[PDB]
């Protein structure tokens, strides 16, 4: 029970680092001219749909764990 | 293994335990107390509660589980209120979209949203009843969607 | 005369609709309580 | 003063059918705009005339099959006989059909000032139902006086309970 | 028409069935012609629906039900038997062709001067004359009488018919 | 001079401006182009010194609004009297109060929640009262349901008089400002007329209602043989049996032979040993002392008759040398700025409510109040919490004075701004006292925490270890033991049984036990002095740095609810005089959370519980304070782990609604943190990234969906941190003490 929780908190730390250097990549390392309509430029293009749908599935689960847990708890 | 719930042991253990446990308060009152009649109604609402969960699946926990596969034997469990629900907030969503594309073309769209025009509101509240084949036929005209709206830098 | 405009605003009609559908849920859960089927 | 009283000369009223005058000693018409109050006066006096004729008619012996009276107030013999009968519900509910449905907007007509707040039409009488000036106003004051006397008279027909405990006719049968 | 000066609503007097009566001013906010169409349609299907409560007598019982004069769980007797789903298929597949715009407040097809569609009228003795008014009165009467039959089936449950002769609670 | 000039037909009373939301603010009558107009509509609903600078129109608005507040209070008390009438078991509670738990609210039977109807006795169930209404009704002498119905209907009658009064005093008779700045008359009628005739007339109610009734109920008469309070005034004969000084009439009063009134009035103190409340002879005598004393107090303000003071000639006369000008200006500050008056009255009102809590736990003034411990707890706790919040309202509205209504011409070299000349020396020494008390109030707990954790319990701060016996509190408590023979000469018992003699028990329930204060109670008092000094630091830093700091030297040019200045000066987030009040609400939650965590655990260890045969003792935790309050593991374990166990196992029973308002209040507490930590620079284009998903489906809302502003996006974090944080201790406390007491 120490190894599991150990590698899990290290696991979540390292995902959050991968995304944080994602944002460091898009700020201090990204050139949208060698990436002329590239796959990354395509990613920055339709990013509104990506954030709208992560916000959608997050809004679906958070009314349907907390919906079901407050239902079961009541 | 999901046993059928009408014959599971721990289910009927919860029947005896909750009818008896709630029944323990029922001997605290006389034969014509209003509370005693209320717990008569409550004991009725427990035996009905456990007879009306007969065709469910309570496993070893004695608690009625559900199944969301669309097995068509569990359709009254999940998929019938699923399609029912999707009809209800497809109603609500098509009402709200239809009312916003009303007030988008009015005099002052700001004052339209504080003070709802209950004439035109209750027009769209009731008219948005058949949103699959009305929203679908407004989709086939290429009008449910849009194109070239706002966006950031790229 | 202009009271019906106040009874057409956002919070008042919000209460006269969520009060109403709230009464749909409660009056539909007194008549048919413990409704997990269908 | 314009009042036939101590002194408050025509605070707001005087042309209304108070033929002996405008009474109003306490500041209600001062701040209530008087049309609401005129509808309250007239509606209370109508329902009080029905109240006092109800008490008299019930004291003159009419029951299909019910409880005997011995009084016409004090709920669990008379008033809460019919509520637990499930009987006075609808005779309230049609009053709900009169008041919420065809009396509440009429009161709205008795706010904007186009009502003369009696006047639910209602003259089913030939040879005497003058809608005009003389008989309409001198009869509206008569409805008003007999209605007010019904209000105090129904007060007296209620509160003869403590040293009475009996009917009003049997109050007349003792002094 | 209603005497206490309550008559400037959104209505019109040339409308059929007009007698000047809306104290709760439902004519406002609810599209008076669509309300007229709802009164006509509620009157006609209520009119047929209480005509069924007159033809619960021995005529036309063809081999399928055999259980007349129930009017309560008769709804359960024919929901349970099936094909009332199919009578929603009958009304649904008619009514698509009746109105052809078929949406409640959105796009009411005000074309033919009147809430009456295509003239479903093979007999065709009157046109849209003041016969419409005596359709409206025989519609409203057949609404409230329909309700009285059903609540008579509710608390008494005895007879839709023989409450008329000498039977009283 | 004193004269009442009243405008008539001020404002027409149509519903026209209800159709114009934000009619009142010309800064906000533009209409919502964004959703921030929605919340600014409510944030400017009562900024009365932001509608118009004209103090006449403002003063009409507020003075009419008070009648709306009193209308809601009379609807509230009429609600409590009706829920006492129709729904409560108060008539059955009046028979045996120590057995029947008080309940009014009878939960409607929907799915499950009919199990909340606790069978508390009286033959009729419902959820149990903790507000203690039945004790105030037994004290007030309400016998049967009829006075509860009638007093409820009079509550609606006064509610109608306050709605009609407020409408009448904004619209069709509203006064001038010269009525309002006539403040010697206002004190002259509130000291004398309000409080004087209030306490005098209440002495009338207690002598002619409560003393016969709570003499009969003290004698144990059933609530049918008790005559009405009606019948004690038709004849003195039913009271001369009970109190034989009524036979003499008012004749010994007018001859000043007040020795004769020892039956009606006395000075005994202590508690009634039968009912567990104060002697209503002492309480009625007490309200006479407030009566004559306040009617003396009212007549020191010259109004028309040239007899009395004015506040100007008082404040000028204290021209002290170390202040220079003296109190010159404060009569012009407090009669032209409302927010300063709200600062003073919320400070003294809140501290009065705290005083109310401390005087109710130790001198329980209602009969059978200290018997049922939840009503004893939650009337300490509730009045402690509003008694907290009103002090932050003082710390806010003092700053709202200092930002808006400060004017250096009237306010030049007086007692006020000479503080602000050395506000560095104010706030710096509050900073020192906060650090010194934090070390010496909480470092002692880390000390005992380590020494108990390091095994060396010889080095703790217990009674066995290095003791910290509170010397001063034990000494003056020993003086309060020696009061009623020595100094309170005509007394019999002490001021309380939190001070002196052996305990008072009613129905084998400990009403009040003498509280012992040794070496753990000490350190919790230094918690309280510490967290009081921190709120005083944030709420004096919020006022002395309100108008012009040395960080930001134009805050009055920015306002009161401004969020910040910018990232300049290395970041100036959260710097306004409002933002200190934002902080003082969290420290309000801290300070009162450990006040009631001192209360509800010292008095579950040292006072409350039962008594057994031969007068033997039994507390609820069983003396488990001084060996356990000294640490934090003893505090968290032995209090928050152990006292939670009756909130947590509360399912399947009538205490399960506290088991829902416990977890849901943990949810609201945890839900505040989302608003506190993040900010609208995230949420605004998170939201706008959702606005793309509405613009794609043409569901663009016409009011533009902004995020919250900054000050709203932290005010809501306060108002959830406190709602969830307070409702956790609410559900924990009532589910703790209802489950036993
Ligand atoms: C208890 C703590 C708590 C809770 C419940 C949430 C919940 C959520 N956060 Mg979150 N958050 C928190 C703490 C919390 N956070 C903290 C501490 C941080 C660090 C500051 C963040 C940082 C953060 C970020 C950065 C983001 C979120 C987002 C979200 C949402 C995810 C979508 C979803 O599940 O919606 C489901 C909805 C809910 C779970 C809401 C709860 C249900 C409510 C209570 C019912 C509705 C009201 C109810 C009827 C009561 C009425 C009240 C009465 C006055 C009438 C969700 C609302 C994201 C978002 O916006 O997604 C769309 C997002 O981008 N959060
Ligand atoms: C006009 C009504 C309306 C409609 C059709 C939609 C439709 C949509 N919203 Mg939504 N939304 C609405 C109102 C509406 N919203 C309101 C009022 C709010 C503020 C609370 C939000 C907040 C919101 C968020 C935060 C998110 C969406 C998202 C979405 C999309 C995914 C579906 C979903 O989970 O909804 C979400 C539904 C809710 C959050 C709750 C429903 C909102 C209210 C309670 C019901 C709306 C009815 C409306 C008020 C009726 C008014 C008109 C009537 C009086 C005439 C979808 C396009 C998501 C997205 O981008 O996915 C791609 C997303 O992340 N919406
Ligand atoms: C606005 C929501 C709403 C709706 C749609 C209904 C609908 C209904 N109520 Mg109702 N009711 C409501 C709110 C509502 N109620 C409220 C707020 C109260 C408390 C005052 C009641 C109290 C109430 C009683 C006491 C009764 C109803 C009854 C009924 C039914 C009669 C037809 C109907 C289903 C009757 C019924 O059928 O119940 C047996 C009945 O006897 N209602
Ligand atoms: C007795 C009631 C009654 C009356 C007076 C009318 C009258 C009318 N209807 Mg009509 N209608 C009724 C009942 C009635 N309807 C019912 C119950 C339905 C539902 C099936 C309809 C459905 C209907 C439609 C769909 C249309 C009309 C239309 C019309 C108008 C012209 C048609 C015509 O020749 O009618 C003359 C009618 C009669 C002489 C009444 C004969 C009824 C007999 C006596 C019934 C016998 C009972 C029998 C045992 C079964 C006319 C005003 C049309 C319209 O509005 O114009 C465009 C139209 O399109 N009606
Ligand atoms: C002796 C007379 C008297 C009395 C009893 C009061 C009492 C009160 N004043 Mg008040 N006041 C007075 C004189 C008086 N005032 C004078 C002379 C002035 C002008 C200098 C003011 C100016 C003033 C302001 C500016 C405010 C008050 C407020 C209040 C209320 C505080 C809330 C409270 O304690 O609730 C307890 C409630 C009660 C005890 C109920 C009291 C009701 C009884 C019947 C006494 C009321 C008699 C009434 C004043 C007579 C009006 C005469 C008119 C009818 C002809 C309280 C009702 C505050 C408030 O809330 O506004 C209303 C407030 O903001 N007063
Ligand atoms: C549990 C978390 C926590 C802690 C410990 C503190 C502690 C403190 N806050 Mg605080 N605060 C907190 C949460 C906390 N806050 C939160 C959540 C808010 C949100 C609103 C605030 C808001 C706030 C404001 C607004 C202010 C403070 C201030 C202060 C200081 C008060 C002076 C004092 O007590 O000094 C004594 C210090 C302690 C009791 C901390 C423990 C020290 C131990 C006893 C001794 C040292 C330990 C050890 C020996 C160190 C050496 C070893 C190490 C070097 C290896 C104090 C340091 C005030 C300030 O600036 O100072 C006056 C102030 O104005 N706080
Ligand atoms: C802040 C609160 C506080 C206090 C009062 C103490 C006090 C003590 N701790 Mg301690 N401790 C604390 C917090 C505290 N601790 C915390 C927070 C931790 C965990 C980090 C520990 C961990 C700890 C350990 C592990 C141990 C102690 C021990 C001790 C004891 C001996 C330490 C010693 O020699 O003092 C040193 C004292 C000084 C150097 C004196 C400086 C202060 C003087 C009095 C200021 C005077 C100024 C004066 C008033 C100016 C005005 C006059 C002038 C103008 C003329 C002593 C009782 C030891 C023990 O065995 O306990 C018996 C021990 O082993 N503590
Ligand atoms: C209280 C004793 C304070 C002695 C100050 C005596 C005093 O206030 O004299 C009053 C003096 C003002 O002198 P004047 O003669 O000008 O005063 C008359 C004028 O103030 C009236 O216009 O104020 C000070 O010198 C301020 C010093 C504050 C310095 C900090 C004092 C606060 C620290 C103590 C906090 C303790 C609170 C707990 C009390 C136990
Ligand atoms: C309430 C209470 C009463 C009931 C009271 C009321 C009066 C109930 C009666 C209501 C009547 C008015 C019902 C009327 C029914 C009329 C039928 C439905 C008409 C049918 C016409 C249809 C077939 C349409 C006809 C088209 C007419 C037209 C000629 C077109 O070209 C073509 C064509 C033929 C389609 C009692 C006392 C009687 C009985 C109690 O039990 C209950
Ligand atoms: C069961 C199974 C399976 C399946 C599985 C899979 C394979 C899945 C998939 C899935 C996956 C496997 C996924 C992954 C994940 C990953 C992640 C997690 C990623 C993300 C990323 C990050 C984190 C970051 C980001 C970024 C940015 C932001 C910018 C730049 C770019 C980048 C990318 C860097 C198989 C077939 C094998 C077989 C059988 C079994
Ligand atoms: C989540 C969050 C938001 C977003 C909060 C959104 C904007 C408000 C969500 C609740 C509102 C009330 C939803 C609006 C819905 C209307 C009530 C209509 C719904 C229909 C009925 C319920 C009436 C911020 O604006 C914010 C600002 C500053 C710091 C932190 C935060 C922050 O954490």
Curated annotation (Swiss-Prot), chain A:
| Transmembrane segment boundaries | 1-27, 49-71
Subcellular location, record wording: Plastid, Chloroplast thylakoid membrane
Instruction: Output the superkingdom of the source species.
Output: Eukaryota
Its function, per the record, reads: PsaA and PsaB bind P700, the primary electron donor of photosystem I (PSI), as well as the electron acceptors A0, A1 and FX. PSI is a plastocyanin/cytochrome c6-ferredoxin oxidoreductase, converting photonic excitation into a charge separation, which transfers an electron from the donor P700 chlorophyll pair to the spectroscopically characterized acceptors A0, A1, FX, FA and FB in turn. Oxidized P700 is reduced on the lumenal side of the thylakoid membrane by plastocyanin or cytochrome c6.
Name the family the entry cites. Belongs to the PsaA/PsaB family.
Self-association state and partner proteins as the record states:
The PsaA/B heterodimer binds the P700 chlorophyll special pair and subsequent electron acceptors. PSI consists of a core antenna complex that captures photons, and an electron transfer chain that converts photonic excitation into a charge separation. The eukaryotic PSI reaction center is composed of at least 11 subunits.
Q: What is this protein called?
A: Photosystem I P700 chlorophyll a apoprotein A2
Q: Which organism is it from?
A: Cyanidioschyzon merolae (strain NIES-3377 / 10D) (Unicellular red alga)
Q: Which residues of the whole protein are included?
A: 367 to 440 of 732
Curated annotation (Swiss-Prot), chain C:
Q: Per the UniProt entry, what are the Gene Ontology biological process annotations, in alphabetical order?
A: photosynthesis
Q: The organism sits in which domain of life? A: Eukaryota
InterPro entries, alphabetically? PSI_PsaJ, PSI_PsaJ_sf
Gene Ontology annotations for the cellular component aspect, listed alphabetically: chloroplast thylakoid membrane; photosystem I
- Major localization class: plastid
The record's Pfam families line, in alphabetical order, gives: PSI_PsaJ
How does the record classify its membrane topology? Answer: Single-pass membrane protein
The UniProt keywords, alphabetically, are: Chloroplast, Membrane, Photosynthesis, Photosystem I, Plastid, Thylakoid, Transmembrane, Transmembrane helix
| Cell location | Plastid, Chloroplast thylakoid membrane
Task: Enumerate the transmembrane spans.
Answer: 6-26
Asked if Transmembrane is a keyword of the record, the answer is yes
Q: Which family does it belong to?
A: Belongs to the PsaJ family.
As for what it does, the entry says: May help in the organization of the PsaE and PsaF subunits.
Q: Which HAMAP family match?
A: PSI_PsaJ
PANTHER family, A to Z: PHOTOSYSTEM I REACTION CENTER SUBUNIT IX, PTHR36082
Record protein name field: Photosystem I reaction center subunit IX
The species is: Cyanidioschyzon merolae (strain NIES-3377 / 10D)
Print the organism lineage.
Answer: Eukaryota, Rhodophyta, Bangiophyceae, Cyanidiales, Cyanidiaceae
Q: Which gene encodes it?
A: psaJ
Swiss-Prot record, chain F:
Q: Which residues bind chlorophyll a?
A: 674, 682
Principal localization?
plastid
Q: Which reaction does it catalyse?
A: reduced [plastocyanin] + hnu + oxidized [2Fe-2S]-[ferredoxin] = oxidized [plastocyanin] + reduced [2Fe-2S]-[ferredoxin]
Q: Which residues bind chlorophyll a'?
A: 666
**Is Zinc given among the entry's keywords?**
no
The record's PROSITE patterns line, in alphabetical order, gives: PHOTOSYSTEM_I_PSAAB
Q: What is its EC number?
A: 1.97.1.12
Tell me, which GO biological process terms does this entry list? photosynthesis
Q: Which GO terms describe its cellular component?
A: chloroplast thylakoid membrane; photosystem I
Q: Where in the cell is it found?
A: Plastid, Chloroplast thylakoid membrane
Which Gene Ontology terms cover its molecular function?
A: 4 iron, 4 sulfur cluster binding; chlorophyll binding; electron transfer activity; magnesium ion binding; oxidoreductase activity
Entry note: cofactor:
P700 is a chlorophyll a/chlorophyll a' dimer, A0 is one or more chlorophyll a, A1 is one or both phylloquinones and FX is a shared 4Fe-4S iron-sulfur center.
**Chain residues that bind [4Fe-4S] cluster:** 564, 573
What class does this enzyme belong to in the EC scheme? Answer: oxidoreductase
Q: Which residues cross the membrane?
A: 62-85, 148-171, 187-211, 283-301, 338-361, 377-403, 425-447, 522-540, 580-601, 655-677, 715-735
- How does the protein associate with the membrane? Multi-pass membrane protein
Residues given in the record as phylloquinone binding sites = 683
Give the protein's biological function.
PsaA and PsaB bind P700, the primary electron donor of photosystem I (PSI), as well as the electron acceptors A0, A1 and FX. PSI is a plastocyanin/cytochrome c6-ferredoxin oxidoreductase, converting photonic excitation into a charge separation, which transfers an electron from the donor P700 chlorophyll pair to the spectroscopically characterized acceptors A0, A1, FX, FA and FB in turn. Oxidized P700 is reduced on the lumenal side of the thylakoid membrane by plastocyanin or cytochrome c6.
UniProt cross-references to NCBIfam families, sorted A to Z: psaA
Q: Which family does it belong to?
A: Belongs to the PsaA/PsaB family.
UniProt-recorded name of the protein: Photosystem I P700 chlorophyll a apoprotein A1
Q: From which organism does this entry originate?
A: Cyanidioschyzon merolae (strain NIES-3377 / 10D) (Unicellular red alga)
């Amino acid at each position: 029970s120490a190894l599991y929780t150990h590698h899990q908190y290290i696991a979540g730390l390292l995902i959050v680092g991968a995304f944080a250097h994602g944002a460091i990549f898009f700020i201090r390392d990204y050139d949208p001219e060698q990436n002329q309509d590239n796959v990354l430029a395509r990613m920055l293009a339709h990013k509104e749909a990506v954030i709208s749908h992560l916000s959608w599935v997050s809004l679906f689960l958070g009314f349907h764990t907390l919906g079901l847990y407050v239902h079961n708890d009541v | 293994v999901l046993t059928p719930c009408q014959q599971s042991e721990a289910f009927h253990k919860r029947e005896i335990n909750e009818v008896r446990t709630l029944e323990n308060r029922q001997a605290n009152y006389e034969a014509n107390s209003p509370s005693y009649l209320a717990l008569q109604s409550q004991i009725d609402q427990v035996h009905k509660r456990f007879d009306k969960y007969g065709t469910l699946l309570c496993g070893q926990d004695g608690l009625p589980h559900l199944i969301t596969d669309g097995d068509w034997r569990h359709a009254r469990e999940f998929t019938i209120p699923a399609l029912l629900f999707l009809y209800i907030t497809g109603w609500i969503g098509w009402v709200g979209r239809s009312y916003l594309k009303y007030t988008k073309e009015t005099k002052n769209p700001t004052e339209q949203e504080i003070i709802l025009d209950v004439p035109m509101a209750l027009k769209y509240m009731l008219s948005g009843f058949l949103w699959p084949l009305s929203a679908w036929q407004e989709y086939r005209s290429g009008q449910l969607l849009a194109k070239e709206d706002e966006i950031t830098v790229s | 005369m202009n009271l019906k405009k106040y009874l057409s605003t956002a919070p008042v009609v919000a209460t006269l609709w969520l009060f109403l559908t709230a009464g749909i849920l409660i009056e539909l859960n007194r008549f048919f309580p413990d409704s997990l089927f269908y | 003063p314009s009042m036939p009283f101590l002194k408050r000369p025509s605070k707001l009223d005087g042309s209304l059918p108070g033929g002996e005058g405008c009474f109003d000693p306490l500041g209600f018409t001062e701040v209530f705009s008087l049309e609401w109050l005129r509808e309250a006066e007239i509606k209370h006096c109508r329902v009080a005339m029905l109240a006092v004729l109800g008490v008299i008619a019930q004291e003159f012996g009419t029951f299909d099959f019910y409880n005997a009276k011995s009084k016409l107030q004090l709920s669990p013999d008379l008033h809460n006989q019919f509520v637990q009968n499930g009987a006075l519900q609808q005779i309230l509910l049609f009053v709900c059909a009169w008041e919420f449905i065809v009396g509440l907007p009429a009161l709205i007509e008795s706010v904007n000032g186009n009502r003369e707040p009696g006047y639910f039409g209602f003259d089913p009488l030939k040879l005497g139902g003058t809608v005009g000036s003389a008989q309409w106003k001198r009869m509206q004051a008569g409805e008003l006086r007999n209605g007010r006397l019904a209000m105090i008279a129904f007060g007296g027909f209620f509160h003869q309970q403590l040293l009475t405990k009996q009917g009003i006719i049997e109050q007349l049968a003792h002094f | 028409a209603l005497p206490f000066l309550s008559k400037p609503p959104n209505l019109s007097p040339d409308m059929p069935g007009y007698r000047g009566f809306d104290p709760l001013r439902f004519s406002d906010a609810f599209d008076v012609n669509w309300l007229q169409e709802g009164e006509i349609k509620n009157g006609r299907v209520a009119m047929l629906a209480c005509l069924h409560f007159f033809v619960t007598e021995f005529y036309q019982f063809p081999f399928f039900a055999g259980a007349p004069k129930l009017a309560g769980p008769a709804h359960d007797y024919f929901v349970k038997s099936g094909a009332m789903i199919q009578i929603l298929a009958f009304i649904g597949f008619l009514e698509f062709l009746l109105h052809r715009g078929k949406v409640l407040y959105s796009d009411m097809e005000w074309k033919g001067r009147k809430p009456g569609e295509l003239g479903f009228n093979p007999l065709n003795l009157p046109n849209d004359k003041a016969m419409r008014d005596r359709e409206v009165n025989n519609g409203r009467l057949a609404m409230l009488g329909f309700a009285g039959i059903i609540h008579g089936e509710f608390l008494n449950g005895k007879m839709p018919f023989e409450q008329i002769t000498n039977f009283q609670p | 001079q004193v004269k009442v000039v009243v405008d008539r037909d001020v404002v027409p009373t149509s519903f026209e401006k209800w159709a114009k939301p934000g009619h009142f603010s010309r800064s906000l009558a533009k209409g919502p182009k964004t959703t921030t107009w929605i919340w600014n509509l409510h944030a400017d609903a009562h900024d009365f010194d932001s509608h118009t600078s004209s103090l006449e129109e403002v003063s009409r608005k507020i003075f009419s609004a008070h009648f709306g507040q009193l209308a809601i209070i009379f609807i509230w008390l009429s609600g409590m009297y009706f829920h006492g009438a129709r729904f409560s078991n108060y008539v059955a509670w009046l028979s045996n109060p120590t057995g029947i738990k008080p309940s009014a609210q009878v939960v409607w039977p929907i799915v499950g929640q009919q199990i909340l109807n606790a069978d508390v006795g009286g033959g009729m169930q419902g959820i149990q009262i903790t507000s203690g209404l039945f004790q105030l009704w037994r004290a007030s002498g309400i016998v049967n349901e009829l006075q509860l119905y009638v007093t409820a209907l009079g509550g609606l009658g006064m509610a109608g008089l306050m709605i009609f009064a407020g409408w009448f005093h904004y619209h069709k008779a509203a006064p001038k400002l010269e009525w309002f700045q006539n403040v010697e008359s206002m004190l002259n009628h509130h000291l004398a007329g309000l409080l004087g005739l209030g306490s005098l007339s209440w002495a009338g109610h207690q002598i002619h209602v409560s003393l016969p009734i709570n003499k009969l109920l003290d004698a144990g008469v059933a609530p049918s043989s008790i005559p009405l309070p009606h019948e004690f005034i038709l004849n003195r004969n039913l009271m001369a049996e009970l109190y034989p000084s009524f036979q003499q009439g008012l004749v010994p009063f007018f001859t000043l032979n007040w020795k004769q009134y020892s039956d009606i009035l006395t000075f005994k103190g202590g508690l009634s040993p039968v009912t567990g409340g104060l002697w209503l002879t002492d309480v009625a005598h007490h309200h006479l002392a407030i009566a004559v004393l306040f009617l003396v107090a009212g007549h020191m303000y010259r109004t028309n008759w040239g007899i009395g003071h004015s506040i100007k000639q008082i404040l000028e006369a204290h021209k002290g040398p170390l202040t220079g000008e003296g109190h010159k200006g404060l009569y012009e500050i407090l009669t032209t700025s409302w927010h300063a008056n709200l600062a003073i009255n919320l400070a003294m009102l809140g501290s009065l409510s705290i005083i109310v809590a401390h005087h109710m736990y130790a001198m329980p003034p209602y009969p059978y109040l200290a018997t049922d411990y939840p009503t004893q707890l939650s009337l300490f706790t509730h009045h402690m919490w509003i008694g907290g919040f009103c002090i932050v309202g003082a710390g806010a509205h003092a700053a709202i004075y200092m930002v808006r209504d400060y004017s250096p011409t009237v306010n030049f070299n007086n007692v006020l701004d000479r503080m602000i000349r050395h506000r560095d020396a104010i706030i710096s020494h509050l900073n020192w006292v906060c650090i010194f008390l934090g070390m010496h109030s909480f470092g002692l707990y880390i000390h005992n925490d380590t020494m108990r954790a390091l095994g060396r319990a010889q080095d703790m701060f217990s009674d066995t270890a290095i003791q910290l016996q509170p010397v001063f509190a034990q000494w003056i408590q020993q003086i309060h033991t020696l009061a009623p023979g020595n100094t309170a000469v005509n007394a019999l018992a002490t001021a309380s049984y939190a001070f002196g003699a052996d305990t008072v028990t009613v129905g084998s329930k400990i009403a009040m036990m003498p509280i012992k204060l040794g070496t753990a109670d000490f350190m919790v008092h230094h918690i309280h002095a510490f967290t009081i000094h921190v709120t005083t630091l944030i709420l004096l830093k919020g006022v002395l740095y309100a108008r012009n700091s040395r960080l930001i030297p134009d805050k009055a040019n920015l306002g009161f609810r401004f969020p910040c200045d910018g990232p300049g000066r290395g970041g100036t987030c959260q710097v306004s005089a409002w933002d200190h009040v934002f902080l003082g609400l969290f420290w309000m939650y801290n300070a009162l959370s450990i006040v009631i965590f001192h209360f509800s655990w010292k008095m579950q260890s040292d006072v409350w519980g039962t008594v057994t045969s031969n007068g033997a003792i039994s507390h609820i935790t069983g003396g488990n304070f001084a060996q356990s309050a000294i640490t934090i593991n003893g505090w968290l374990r032995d209090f928050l782990w152990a006292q939670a166990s009756q909130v947590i196992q509360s399912y399947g029973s009538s205490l399960s609604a506290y088991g829902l308002m416990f977890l849901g209040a943990h949810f609201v507490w945890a839900f505040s943190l989302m608003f506190l930590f993040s900010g609208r620079g995230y949420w605004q284009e998170l939201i706008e990234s959702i606005v793309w998903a509405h613009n794609k489906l043409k569901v663009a809302p016409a009011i533009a969906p902004r995020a919250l502003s900054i000050t709203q996006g932290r005010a809501v974090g306060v108002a959830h941190y406190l709602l969830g944080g307070i409702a956790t201790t609410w559900a924990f406390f009532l589910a703790r003490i209802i489950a036993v007491g």
